[PDB]
Design a protein around this ligand. Sequence first.
Ligand SMILES: [Cl-]
Lengths: 473, 476
Amino acid sequence: GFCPIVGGLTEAALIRVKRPTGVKARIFISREAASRLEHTVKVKDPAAKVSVVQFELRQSNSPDLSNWARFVLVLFPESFEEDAFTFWLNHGDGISNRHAEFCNNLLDFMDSRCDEDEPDYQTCGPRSGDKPAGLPTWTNSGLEEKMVIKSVLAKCIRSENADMLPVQSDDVFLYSTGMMAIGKIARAMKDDTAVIFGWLYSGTLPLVKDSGYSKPILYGRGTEEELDKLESYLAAGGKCTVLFTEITSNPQLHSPNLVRIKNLADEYGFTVVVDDTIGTSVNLDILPYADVVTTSLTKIFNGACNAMGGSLIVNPNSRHYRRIHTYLQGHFEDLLFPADAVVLSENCIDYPERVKRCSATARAIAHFLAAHPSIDYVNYPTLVPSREEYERYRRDGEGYGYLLSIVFREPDFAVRFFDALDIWKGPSIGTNSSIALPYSVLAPKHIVRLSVGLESEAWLRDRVTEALAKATP
Amino acid sequence: GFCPIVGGLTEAALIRVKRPTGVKARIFISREAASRLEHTVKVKDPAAKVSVVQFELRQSNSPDLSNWARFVLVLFPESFEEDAFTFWLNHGDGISNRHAEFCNNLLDFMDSRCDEDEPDYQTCGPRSGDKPAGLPTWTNSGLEEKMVIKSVLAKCIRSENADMLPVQSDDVFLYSTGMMAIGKIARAMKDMDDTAVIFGWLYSGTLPLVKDSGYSKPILYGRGTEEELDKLESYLAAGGKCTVLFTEITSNPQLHSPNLVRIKNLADEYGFTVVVDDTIGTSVNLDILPYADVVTTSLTKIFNGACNAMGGSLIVNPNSRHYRRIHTYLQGHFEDLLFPADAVVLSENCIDYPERVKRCSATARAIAHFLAAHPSIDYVNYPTLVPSREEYERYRRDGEGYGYLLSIVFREPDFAVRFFDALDIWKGPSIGTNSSIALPYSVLAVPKHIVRLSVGLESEAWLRDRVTEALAKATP
Ligand SMILES: [Cl-]
């Protein structure tokens, strides 16, 4: 590792506490998330050594540094293999890259304390008390940039129908990730039963379960048939506190019946949480049907794949606005690192335009793919059986989204096509560059998912044609 | 690989040119470095395909963006194994980390051209012509911060005697790395003259760069001893020619001090220029300006301390008999290649570069003497203990210390490996960091079980404790 070094916060924190070997480590910015990992390790082994070490910048007249130059280090044995929850707990609550680099530059000015009696974890920073050589370029915890973010989110979720109260800046809550935003709303509901309705983003179910819903009613497909089961349960006296769903599903691009969901919610009295990360608030008007909207700002809201953020919009038109907002406000601590909010506030200024552009290309590419003899069918909201459902929420003059998936005729052909496709490959979506993934890596199972970026239709048409050619004998 | 993604500029450029598999890639900011890599591959294997693709943000209302959002991509087959030279050529000329991240964020606004007729390498950016969302925090190519860097370097290199002309801001040249600064002075001398002398400067990219710069009669003096100075003097007196002598003031990893007084005397007689690297010894602790025509420094090291910025410096001595020739060449051939964000961090972190040298050197002196007195220690290489101490005292400023680098020669190599494995400090090849860092001879490719230590800003209590516990753990 030749200098300069990127990353290294975990290795440097391990060295500070004399544990550079024999333990696994995770770094969160909240003591609560650290505890949720400690509890999961302790449930698998009640005798496991798990320490929680708080790092913090001890003496400074600058509240910016003192508020953000802090992190929590969690040590636990390597014998513990990480399951789905600890993956999504770290995904949603792990320190951001920029926040980690900010702390590592200031680590010499920070001290470490632990509640347990381990003297190796009680360390004084070599430069604690001294003034850092550099002040960050952002100011006031990035509150200026956070308000830009909240303002754009509030404007873009405005309903095209003028009978509803508009979402305001302060009805939007910003968190570190979209996963964290989902967790925060899950605990807020926990203070009856929770329903998961056709939401295959693999991290929702673990967090809802961890938030105190031991076993939520899971409706995997999101169909009308499953809504019949839910209504049959509710009509028979069953109770429900909250329903979680996402508008425009992954990877089949299905649209749930939000109108019927909202009608059942008004009749039987549960809260509706809708994730519009894939569907987008630019393309869809879902405010009439959702009490809380969640969004992963890391995705197309940012586009540049270089910042994390999550948002929580409380609908002022909701019957539970008062209760929900008060809980979130009364339990709100700012965990969106300012440097991340600076990039998000800059990149979201053209978030409507980029959604419009990607959606135009994705609609064209999907219809191009559908016409190819090797393709069985393409999952895109203009082709799927919920085609009529999507049109109930689509805004006039807006398109059909940036995500699609390809179901090929032959699984052999699917793999040869993916390997020949000269575009970015990985699990993220909503990027400025096009990106593909098979079902394999997403933990029919030969389906290939495509998130269309800002490249021209000719460019993407060409990359796909060449890949299609090489996949045929 | 979930987003955000760090790095990825190389992967993104490869995808742009439809070469995501089957080829290796390197990214430089200069076409000349690209050519020097192309030539080394073409002589090791003439039939290997090597292309040079220029990426650039052509037009912009911000001259900051257009000037810096450009880079050179070099493609070559995976069969080519990198040798010692191509490693150090990329180390000195590779795009900086911050520069790489800046380009990747703007890559959609950039186009790619190639001189050869390969249509896959002629691409238009998806957002070419559009304006980027947000601009960089730095302004005017970081000229304000670059002036701070040059000012601090000039102030710290003042000789302790006031009859010498002082180095000014405009006698200091900034480059991307210490290695690049060494390259620029090496090629500058070659225009005048064929023989270059490398005098006790091991484990570095100087020899590859000096050889690559056109010096067809190199002389390598590995130890830096007076016996090697005797051979050089006999050669020069007998009619031998010498263009330039390269040396480093405190050597790696034995902390040796060359006889700069004798070197400067030979230079005055036979008319060659002396280039001295003071990265290890530092201008804070040492006054070597009287004996050098050009001083070079790796700003990435203790000048910055924070291991989060890249930089190199070239100081032309105004008291040099060749000041005019050297300065006009360096300015007349100057391209600003120090990425502004790197210059911003360097300008901030260099404000306490004197104090940090004073702190590290004080800790390093105490730890070295602690180690030297230990029964398991054969000897410790540190300027207070080594046989060339009297030479170090010739240039040491009064009231300043003996440096931050040391190395440990243990009695038994087995003990060395158990001590190193037990040493709970950062491990790696870099030096001049705010945190202490160790390395063995293994990664360093002189006894071959040597352990090198670059002492950071931690107190002696912390460092003595880390060393004591490792010493205990090293015994069976
Ligand atoms: Cl309905």
